[PDB]
Amino acid sequence: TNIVTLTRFVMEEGRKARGTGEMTQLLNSLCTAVKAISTAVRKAGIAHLYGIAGSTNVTGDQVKKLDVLSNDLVINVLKSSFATCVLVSEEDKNAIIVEPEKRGKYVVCFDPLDGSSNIDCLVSIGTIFGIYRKNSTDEPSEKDALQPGRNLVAAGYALYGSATMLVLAMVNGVNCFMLDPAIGEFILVDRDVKIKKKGSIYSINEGYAKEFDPAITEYIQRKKFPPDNSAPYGARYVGSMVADVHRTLVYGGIFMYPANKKSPKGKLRLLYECNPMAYVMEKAGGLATTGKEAVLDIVPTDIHQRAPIILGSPEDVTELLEIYQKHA
Amino acid sequence: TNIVTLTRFVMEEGRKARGTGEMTQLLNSLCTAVKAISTAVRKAGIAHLYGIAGSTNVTGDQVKKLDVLSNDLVINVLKSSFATCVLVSEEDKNAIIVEPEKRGKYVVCFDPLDGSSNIDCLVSIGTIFGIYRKNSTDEPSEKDALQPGRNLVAAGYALYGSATMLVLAMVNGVNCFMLDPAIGEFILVDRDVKIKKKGSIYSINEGYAKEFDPAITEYIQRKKFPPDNSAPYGARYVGSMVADVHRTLVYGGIFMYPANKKSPKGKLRLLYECNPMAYVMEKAGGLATTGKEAVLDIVPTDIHQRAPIILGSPEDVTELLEIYQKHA
Numbered sequence: 001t002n003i004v005t006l007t008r009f010v011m012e013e014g015r016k017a018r019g020t021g022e023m024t025q026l027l028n029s030l031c032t033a034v035k036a037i038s039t040a041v042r043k044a045g046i047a048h049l050y051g052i053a054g055s056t057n058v059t060g061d062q063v064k065k066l067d068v069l070s071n072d073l074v075i076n077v078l079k080s081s082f083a084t085c086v087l088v089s090e091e092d093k094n095a096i097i098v099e100p101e102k103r104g105k106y107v108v109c110f111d112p113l114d115g116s117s118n119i120d121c122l123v124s125i126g127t128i129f130g131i132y133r134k135n136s137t138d139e140p141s142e143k144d145a146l147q148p149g150r151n152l153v154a155a156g157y158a159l160y161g162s163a164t165m166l167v168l169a170m171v172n173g174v175n176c177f178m179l180d181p182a183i184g185e186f187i188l189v190d191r192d193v194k195i196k197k198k199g200s201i202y203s204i205n206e207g208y209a210k211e212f213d214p215a216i217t218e219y220i221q222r223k224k225f226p227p228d229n230s231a232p233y234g235a236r237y238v239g240s241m242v243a244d245v246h247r248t249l250v251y252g253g254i255f256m257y258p259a260n261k262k263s264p265k266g267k268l269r270l271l272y273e274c275n276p277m278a279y280v281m282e283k284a285g286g287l288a289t290t291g292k293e294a295v296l297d298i299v300p301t302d303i304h305q306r307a308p309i310i311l312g313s314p315e316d317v318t319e320l321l322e323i324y325q326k327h328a
Numbered sequence: 329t330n331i332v333t334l335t336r337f338v339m340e341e342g343r344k345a346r347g348t349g350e351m352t353q354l355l356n357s358l359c360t361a362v363k364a365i366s367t368a369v370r371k372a373g374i375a376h377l378y379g380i381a382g383s384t385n386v387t388g389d390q391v392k393k394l395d396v397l398s399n400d401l402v403i404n405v406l407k408s409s410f411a412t413c414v415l416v417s418e419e420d421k422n423a424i425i426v427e428p429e430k431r432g433k434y435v436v437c438f439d440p441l442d443g444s445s446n447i448d449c450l451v452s453i454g455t456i457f458g459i460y461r462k463n464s465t466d467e468p469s470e471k472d473a474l475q476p477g478r479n480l481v482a483a484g485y486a487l488y489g490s491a492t493m494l495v496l497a498m499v500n501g502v503n504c505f506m507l508d509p510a511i512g513e514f515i516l517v518d519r520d521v522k523i524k525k526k527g528s529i530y531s532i533n534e535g536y537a538k539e540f541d542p543a544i545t546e547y548i549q550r551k552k553f554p555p556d557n558s559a560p561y562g563a564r565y566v567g568s569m570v571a572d573v574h575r576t577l578v579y580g581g582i583f584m585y586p587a588n589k590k591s592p593k594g595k596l597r598l599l600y601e602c603n604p605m606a607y608v609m610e611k612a613g614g615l616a617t618t619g620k621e622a623v624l625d626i627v628p629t630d631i632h633q634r635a636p637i638i639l640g641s642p643e644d645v646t647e648l649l650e651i652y653q654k655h656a
């Protein structure tokens with residue numbers, strides 16, 4: 001019929017679903033935040049920090065840092081949606097308990113800004129989120145954050161790259177929305193997205209070679225030296241999970257972040273990094289595993305618990321799991 | 329002292345220069361070209377393409393691609409400068425001779441948009457440019473663009489990443505200007521840029537391992553298994569040269585793209601990819617070699633001649649060079 005906007009989409013769901021509305025309000029809030037973060041990432045108005053209007057010689061570099069500004073934007077915007085009671089963020093040691101006068105029936109685990117190491121060099125970065133409906137009637141507490149990804153109602157991420165895109169995964173599938181920064185609307189460009197069965201790119205940090213387990217080690221040799229004499233896979237690794245996963249989703253292949261010396265249980269976080277992306281991958285028709293068990297079925301025991309993950313096209317991930325059994 | 333916009337910076341170089349004012353007009357052009365491309369890259373107005381105003385009878389004129397657009401912006405904006413006579417673009421099979429009624433004395437080699445494999449996945453991309461002064465004194469010809477990079481008077485790139493940055497290198501140094509997209513000005517944010525002596529990140533597509541020469545193989549192995557038992561280098565490889573070289577510049581380290589079987593003499597182009605980055609690296613106090621000789625010393629015989637390239641921290645690059653030496 002005609003163009004579809006995130007606002008419209010999040011609403012059509014609301015009609016169909018016939019619910020309190022909370023989720024639709026929560027998702028609109030999210031959007032409003034991703035737009036603010038995006039404009040800040042692109043550094044709009046930076047001339048004002050460098051004294052274009054002067055500064056009466058009194059502006060020590062005490063500007064709130066992008067990483068911190070993102071958290072503030074997400075907390076406050078979600079807290080104004082009236083759809084949440086518990087919020088977990090990478091930037092906060094404890095789960096944030098929402099004021100009673102504004103609480104809702106949802107729990108959100110998020111990474112306001114992922115790709116920290118790439119921040120100063122201008123590489124793509126992003127915001128990650130997974131949403132859970134409360135699972136009991138006890139007074140709100142971190143407890144509600146420890147629900148397995150298997151119980152996610154919605155998940156996704158915002159990629160601030162060459163352009164800004166919001167990928168949202170819900171029970172019925174995955175959709176990609178492109179931010180039109182000129183009017184501030186996320187336009188739907190890819191509907192019910194599905195990952196490729198087998199890709200041709202593998203992504204992982206090889207500087208950890210000396211610490212890889214026998215399975216990872218074997219797998220890598222295969223991509224470079226195909227036992228069946230097939231074309232070796234190309235290698236890509238941005239260093240920003242949102243960016244690597246996003247490419248995995250749209251181009252195919254596999255992305256790996258396993259255990260190594262300093263990261264026995266892996267590095268990536270379960271609540272706000274592994275789970276959202278795993279849900280996104282599965283909802284898009286791909287796999288996401290620790291190498292041994294599926295990421296969504298893990299029962300988190302701490303809000304900043306780390307987990308090893310491997311995700312991407314089915315066959316690519318299957319083959320690596322194949323190798324893991326071989327070594328078991 | 330106060331804010332410095334690239335425009336202010338380019339006008340003052342000129343004053344000192346005491347010349348025709350042509351370089352200034354040229355850099356002005358480039359800037360305008362860069363800002364428009366950045367705006368296109370970020371997808372402003374995309375709502376219109378998706379019917380926000382209804383059927384726009386758009387047909388035969390299949391929408392214009394970012395790559396074609398960018399080239400057209402750069403080709404047009406440069407001609408308007410009245411400061412050039414020969415343009416070499418990756419997108420053009422032949423050097424563009426500027427019509428007589430618009431001829432300036434400069435030759436420019438550029439890549440309107442680099443990292444084309446990262447376009448559809450929203451990964452950082454950029455524009456690379458290298459500028460020359462007409463060597464001869466006879467009718468403008470492709471030959472004029474066939475000069476070693478040592479002859480460059482100005483070179484750099486516009487990186488369309490999380491934020492847009494234009495890096496400009498000239499005889500007296502390298503300067504970084506952040507694009508404030510709200511007013512269309514580039515703000516100098518890092519003056520007299522120097523790369524670090526030793527890094528801790530290497531950047532190469534290992535999917536070609538099977539085809540690497542013995543030196544690359546040895547050096548790579550040494551990065552993961554530091555014979556000095558120190559911490560191994562972290563790995564990063566975005567896939568877009570600009571993003572990758574840019575990271576190298578601000579964090580230090582080493583970027584590589586040697587020759588492989590399908591790429592007998594490397595993949596990257598000497599004129600609009602390698603030379604400009606080689607130039608930036610040397611002005612920043614870093615090195616750039618093919619493995620046998622300095623990139624800038626090479627004399628071109630084909631405007632689309634490719635070449636292998638190793639750039640970054642001098643210590644890391646020299647380490648690799650001594651390995652080539654040893655294996656000789």
Ligand SMILES: CCC[C@@H](C(=O)NCCc1ccc(O)cc1)[N+]1=C([O-])[C@@H]2Cc3ccccc3CN2C(=O)[C@@H]1Cc1ccc(O)cc1
Nearest residue numbers: 043044045046047048049051052053508509510511512513
């Ligand atoms: C895009 C950033 C805008 C930013 C700003 O810093 N402007 C200063 C000049 C400038 C403009 C663009 C740019 O890229 C760099 C510097 N800004 C505004 O322009 C207007 C000003 C204003 C004045 C009165 C009442 C409300 C507002 C709203 N309003 C804003 O809320 C912000 C912040 C602001 C507000 C008041 C000021 O005196 C200076 C800045």
Ligand SMILES: CCC[C@@H](C(=O)NCCc1ccc(O)cc1)[N+]1=C([O-])[C@@H]2Cc3ccccc3CN2C(=O)[C@@H]1Cc1ccc(O)cc1
Nearest residue numbers: 180181182183184185371372373374375376377378380381
């Ligand atoms: C940021 C895109 C701007 C772009 C556009 O696509 N506008 C359509 C509406 C829209 C707005 C925002 C958006 O994100 C998507 C679609 N645009 C303008 O808004 C104004 C319109 C105009 C009208 C009369 C005379 C001059 C201009 C200049 N002018 C422009 O040159 C461009 C292109 C344009 C011009 C005239 C039109 O009828 C439609 C589009």
Ligand SMILES: O=P(O)(O)OC[C@H]1O[C@](O)(CO)[C@@H](O)[C@@H]1O
Nearest residue numbers: 114115116117205239240241242
């Ligand atoms: O440098 P490393 O150990 O490869 O870490 C990479 C990862 O770090 C993260 O920033 C998370 O901390 C991810 O976004 C990225 O995948």
Ligand SMILES: O=P(O)(O)OC[C@H]1O[C@](O)(CO)[C@@H](O)[C@@H]1O
Nearest residue numbers: 442443444445533567568569570
């Ligand atoms: O797929 P490859 O072999 O890594 O090619 C990547 C290189 O090619 C380019 O896209 C140029 O064609 C560079 O931006 C990049 O580094």
Ligand SMILES: [Mg+2]
Nearest residue numbers: 090111113114
């Ligand atoms: Mg973070």
Ligand SMILES: [Mg+2]
Nearest residue numbers: 111113114115
């Ligand atoms: Mg993160």
Ligand SMILES: [Mg+2]
Nearest residue numbers: 418440441442
């Ligand atoms: Mg190009």
Ligand SMILES: [Mg+2]
Nearest residue numbers: 439441442443
């Ligand atoms: Mg290129």
